[PDB]
């Protein structure tokens, strides 16, 4: 069993250094292959960052200047990423890996100046002229940090027609909305409440969708 595990802070300040740790088990890093670090950006695109050979020798992707070092600790069977002078660019999911198709689970590191910030939750309701049975309502979750949040409707009892759009950045803070579509015989004839949760700040806000 070649098994790899990433570990370390998931949020770093733009000026500082992004340091991670790969804890490899079921195989010795000293008897073996190249031991790599890869990252994946939001775009889904993968970049190779660098490796350290079992001999202690290294190579780094020239795209990272000389602001990366991959050190080691043969005594606990670990190798480390250290990336310096970090920016928005360096936000990615980071993977450690071994040459023969062995990948870690990967951790998502974000780079930001933002403080923990709870979301404002606003109702989304139409103004005039709903067509037939079905009507679509929503909840705008604006200006929160960090990810994630969890949106549900009537405490989860509404599943049928429910989207949640992926979050997006907007002046160093995340925003998304969740849509729900239900028959107008059920709204405003009975309650349609949205429940937003932001674990990072222990928030739990409900917002009833009133018409007009």
């Amino acid at each position: 069993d070649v098994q790899l595990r990433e570990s370390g802070p998931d949020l770093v300040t733009p000026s500082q250094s992004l340091s991670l740790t790969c804890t490899v088990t079921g195989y010795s890093i000293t008897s073996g292959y190249s031991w790599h670090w890869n990252r994946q950006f939001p775009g889904n695109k993968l970049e190779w960052m660098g490796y350290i050979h079992y001999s202690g020798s290294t190579n780094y992707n020239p795209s990272l200047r000389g602001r990366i070092s991959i050190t080691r600790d043969t005594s606990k069977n670990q190798f480390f990423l250290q990336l310096n002078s970090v920016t928005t660019e360096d936000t990615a999911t980071y993977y450690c890996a071994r040459y023969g198709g062995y990948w870690g689970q990967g951790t998502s590191v974000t780079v930001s100046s933002a403080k923990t910030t709870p979301p404002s939750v606003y109702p989304l309701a139409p103004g005039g002229g709903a067509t037939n049975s079905m009507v679509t309502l929503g909840c705008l979750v604006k200006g929160y940090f960090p990810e994630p949040v969890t949106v549900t409707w009537n405490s989860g009892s509404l599943s049928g027609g429910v989207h949640t759009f992926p979050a997006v950045l907007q002046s160093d803070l995340y925003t998304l909305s969740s849509s729900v579509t239900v028959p107008s015989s059920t709204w405003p004839s009975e309650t349609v409440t949205c429940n937003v949760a932001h674990p990072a700040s222990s928030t739990k806000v409900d917002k009833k969708i009133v018409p007009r």
Binding site: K45, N61, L140, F165
Partner: protein, 218 residues
């Protein structure tokens, strides 16, 4: 550096039926030792990359025989005899012949289905938000197919591009439709300066845009 280009960008497939991906290197991938170092990977949604094929045609120790690697030089093709449920996600080709290592941009695999128009829904800003001096005009383009879609914002009939943020969802696991949000964000002072706010949706189902709008004074 050596570039990995994959065709197509998105492949529409149906479970049971076969499928074929392509990958194109800007240099020959034959190393001096005689071996060609081209791998393929599958990244299932929610989890890491996973090796499928390591030397152009060799199948990974843990992968079923329905995957088949062909090619040489600069042209390579990954082929699936029957697309199964667990094959859905992104496929990446990878070269280890030249320094540095380089991955392809990925080919997303998605379930095919009959085209469907968007259900456009426009939303005015809430008074709760307006008390804080903000005004977001939200527009849902819900449950459409295929992925590619166009939004246009108008204010008093005049086009608006500044301050619009968008967000597509992934493919739905139940009806195979996509959805997309579009969000004009304004200040209250800016917002009150105009009356009409229009959300205009153009999709390949119709040449006619699906228009949805409202006026502040009602």
């Amino acid at each position: 550096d050596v570039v990995m280009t994959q065709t197509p960008i998105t492949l529409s497939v149906t479970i049971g039926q076969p499928a074929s991906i392509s990958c194109k290197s800007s240099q020959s991938l034959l190393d001096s030792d005689g071996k060609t170092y081209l791998n393929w990977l599958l990244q299932r949604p929610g989890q890491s990359p996973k090796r499928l094929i390591y030397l152009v045609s060799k199948l990974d120790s843990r992968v079923p025989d329905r995957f088949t690697g062909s090619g040489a030089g600069t042209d390579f093709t990954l082929k699936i005899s029957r697309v199964e449920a667990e094959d859905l996600g992104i496929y990446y080709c990878w070269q280890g012949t030249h320094f540095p290592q380089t991955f392809g941009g990925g080919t997303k695999l998605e379930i095919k289905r009959a085209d469907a128009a968007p259900t456009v829904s426009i939303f005015p800003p809430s008074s709760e938000q307006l008390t804080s001096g903000g005004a977001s005009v939200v527009c849902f383009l819900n449950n459409f197919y295929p992925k590619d879609i166009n939004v246009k914002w108008k204010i008093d009939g005049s086009e608006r591009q500044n301050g619009v943020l968008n967000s597509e969802t992934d493919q739905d696991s139940k009806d195979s439709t996509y959805s997309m949000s579009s969000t004009l964000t304004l200040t209250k002072d800016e917002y009150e300066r105009h009356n009409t706010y229009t959300c205009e949706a153009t999709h390949k189902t119709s040449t006619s845009p699906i228009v949805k709008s409202f006026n502040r004074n009602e």
